[PDB]
Amino acid sequence: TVIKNETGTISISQLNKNVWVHTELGSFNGEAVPSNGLVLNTSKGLVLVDSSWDDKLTKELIEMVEKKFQKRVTDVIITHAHADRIGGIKTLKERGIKAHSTALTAELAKKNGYEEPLGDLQTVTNLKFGNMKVETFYPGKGHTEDNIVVWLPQYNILVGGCLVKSTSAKDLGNVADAYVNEWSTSIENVLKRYRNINAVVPGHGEVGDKGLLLHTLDLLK
Ligand SMILES: [K+]
Ligand SMILES: [Zn+2]
Ligand SMILES: [Zn+2]
């Protein structure tokens, strides 16, 4: 089950009853770089994992899901301070959408001249929205200093974010902000904490499984 905006620009694919992936194309010189997050359909509103590349996409994304599920976006979890995750933080703040992050992610956002998310997430934080349970986990440095994962214990679904490379990624990508000697250890910390995983969402590329974590480990060798 897959739904595109008017344009190609934005797509949502259904994973299960109350969980979808959101994907948006960012436009870079000779063109399209897609980015993924999650949409959680809860009894108390829509909760997103991550925003998008910029404000224009972020608005359009909110407006699509609010229309479709007939409820407001109330909360977003920002999983690190690069533009594909936090690009639409301005839109979030101005609409009264709570933007959750670790304090490190918030510090880095401010350092890079983005508006500040909440800095409310700890190394392990458990949230509940309606009946929907969500855990955030800081496994250590990898793709960036601050990168976190998100876990839906009710579905054993892991949002890997940009810590986790898709099967189509044949290299680590941009590592300016990365910690390639700790990234393996951070991935291992994810595998140790979540020992039975039903689906893994990478920050870019196709949805997979535990094999994506092993793919990323191979990529680090
Ligand atoms: K339950
Ligand atoms: Zn990133
Ligand atoms: Zn990314």
* Nearest ligand to the CA atom of 134: 1
- Would residue 130 be called left, alpha or beta, if left means φ above 0 and alpha means ψ between -120 and 50 degrees? left
Cβ–Cβ < 8 Å for 121, 151:
no
Breaks in the chain (C–N beyond 2.5 Å) sit after none
Residue 150, domain extent: 1-221
Answer yes or no: 82 catalytic.
yes
CATH number at residue 94: 3.60.15.10
Angle, helices 211-219 vs 183-193, to 10°: value is 160
Cβ–Cβ < 8 Å for 77, 46:
no
Q: Which of 84, 100, 146, 147 is catalytic?
A: 84
Distance 160 CA to ligand 2 centre (A): 12
d(CA 163, CA 187): 8
Method by which the model was determined: X-ray
Q: Give the chain's domain count.
A: 1
Q: Which of 82, 146, 147, 215 is catalytic?
A: 82
d(CA 139, CA 76): 20
C-alpha closest to that of 160 among 146, 171, 175, 149: 149
CB atoms within 10 A of CB 124: 11
